[PDB]
């Protein structure tokens, strides 16, 4: 269903962002194992995911407004 798909997509976006943030925090805490070539890449991919989400939101709300404002 639409609600289930939206929840799954938002949850996976949030999980990706949380994983990127925790990896960055582990790196800046000094714990060895992070080479700075993964934290930046994961942050960029998370930003791409957020951009896709906001574009989808804009398109969806525009379509909903267009279909709801019709003079019936």
């Amino acid at each position: 269903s639409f609600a289930g798909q939206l929840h799954a997509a938002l949850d996976r976006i949030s999980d990706r962002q949380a994983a990127a943030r925790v990896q960055a925090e582990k790196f800046t805490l000094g714990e060895p194992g992070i080479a700075l070539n993964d934290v930046m890449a994961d942050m960029q991919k998370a930003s791409v995911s957020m951009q896709m989400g906001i574009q989808v939101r804009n398109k969806l709300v525009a379509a909903y407004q267009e279909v709801m404002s019709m003079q019936v």
């Binding site: 949850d11 949030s14 943030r21 989400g53 939101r57």
Partner: protein, 211 residues
């Protein structure tokens, strides 16, 4: 534990800010109120005698007052644990929506609910409470639409009686060929203002909401 990050949480909040006033208010509490107001406007024998903005404002104030206990419930059950970040949006939304779901379930018609469930092809329910909001909403809308007209006909009755009696008494004496509508309007307005139709009707509809 699992939750949503700040960015996605604020995205969801802003997105819900679009639906919330339009539909979550239009199709939940005062659609029948504005329907009754429009029916009364038509019954008064005059187009837009009370202005539309005034009618909408009165309906909004009335529904705010009506929903006050549910507002307090949802506030004390969701916002307080959420305004101090003691609960995440994921389940906070469900906890907040639960009392409104219960209110919609209480103000519903069993026949409409059964028809919608059969149409959706889902009949495993063991109790009325376990129904989903997806099947609850259209039945609630239909029941509210039914009761709107049920009240509206009762609103119509007295003006119809006045018009019939004035037309009969007017044409019984040889004045058949003259419209009594222009003469019935002052009498209907006098009756309404003398009985205080507005204040009485507001209390009547509030009691109807309280069932």
């Amino acid at each position: 534990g699992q939750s949503w990050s700040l960015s996605v949480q604020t995205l969801v909040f802003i997105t819900s800010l679009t639906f919330l006033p339009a539909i979550l208010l239009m199709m939940t509490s005062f659609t029948r109120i504005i329907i009754v107001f429009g029916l009364l406007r038509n019954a008064l024998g005059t187009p837009s005698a009370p202005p539309n903005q005034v009618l909408l404002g009165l309906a909004l104030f009335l529904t705010f007052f009506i929903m006050s206990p549910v507002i307090d419930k949802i506030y004390v059950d969701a916002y307080q644990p959420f305004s101090e970040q003691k609960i995440s949006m994921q389940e906070a939304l469900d906890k907040g929506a639960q009392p409104l779901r219960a209110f919609m379930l209480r103000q519903t018609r069993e026949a409409d609910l059964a028809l919608f469930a059969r149409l959706a092809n889902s009949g495993p329910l063991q109790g009325p409470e376990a129904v989903p909001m997806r099947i609850l909403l259209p039945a609630y809308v239909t029941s509210e639409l039914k009761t709107a007209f049920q009240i509206g006909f009762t609103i119509f009755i007295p003006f119809l009686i006045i018009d019939l009696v004035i037309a009969s008494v007017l044409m019984a004496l040889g004045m058949m060929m003259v419209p009594p509508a222009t003469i019935a309007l002052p009498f209907k307005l006098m009756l309404f203002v003398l009985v205080d139709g507005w204040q009485l009707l507001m209390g009547s509809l509030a009691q109807s909401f309280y069932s």
